[PDB]
Structures are given as structure tokens and as C-alpha cells.
């Protein structure tokens, strides 16, 4: 596994300002939208839009198809990871 994940999880431990969650506290495949953070879309946007600004990942977070790639950080880094190659 790539450090990626470890720097989405503080991405979006940071960027959703997770209170005593750090990156070690959410695991990678952990559902975001689930009983892990428990994100709602508007959450996704600003977690997509700060992907965007971060690595320029266009991510349609209104689209199911970022939500099946947004369901936890693995995927995540699928998508990130995928964009971070060549």
C-alpha cells in the first residue's frame, strides 16, 4: 500500500476536522458515509473539491461513480493513486 492512504486519511480527517481522529483511528477501507465518519454529500463535494484543489482529481462527488470511489480511503487512493502515476 501506498502513503497515499495515510495522507488521505489526514486529508479528510483534516479537512472534515475529525475531532481525537487521527489517520491510525480510521482505517483505509473504513466507510466514510458509514459508521466510520459518517460523511453527507455535501461533505463529499468539499472533501472532492479539496482532492481537486490538491491534486487536481476530477472527482464527480455529485456522481454515484466518485461515491463508489469515495466509500473509504482504499478507494480513495485508487482514484488519487491513479491520478498521482505518470
Same mark, same amino acid.
Given at each position: ?17 475529525l !475531532? ?8 483505509? !477501507?473504513?466507510?466514510?458515509?458509514g ?7 455535501i461533505?463529499?463535494? !468539499?472533501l472532492?473539491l479539496?482532492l ?7 472527482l ?20 488519487? !493513486? ?5
Amino acid at each position: 500500500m501506498s502513503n497515499l492512504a495515510d495522507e488521505l486519511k489526514q486529508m479528510i480527517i483534516d479537512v472534515l476536522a475529525l !475531532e481525537d481522529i487521527t489517520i491510525a483511528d480510521i482505517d483505509t !477501507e473504513a466507510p466514510l458515509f458509514g459508521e466510520g465518519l459518517g460523511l453527507d454529500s455535501i461533505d463529499a463535494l !468539499e472533501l472532492g473539491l479539496a482532492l481537486k484543489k490538491r491534486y487536481n482529481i476530477h472527482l464527480n462527488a455529485e456522481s454515484d461513480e466518485t461515491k463508489q470511489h469515495f466509500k473509504s480511503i482504499q478507494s480513495l487512493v485508487a482514484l488519487v !493513486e491513479a491520478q498521482q502515476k505518470s
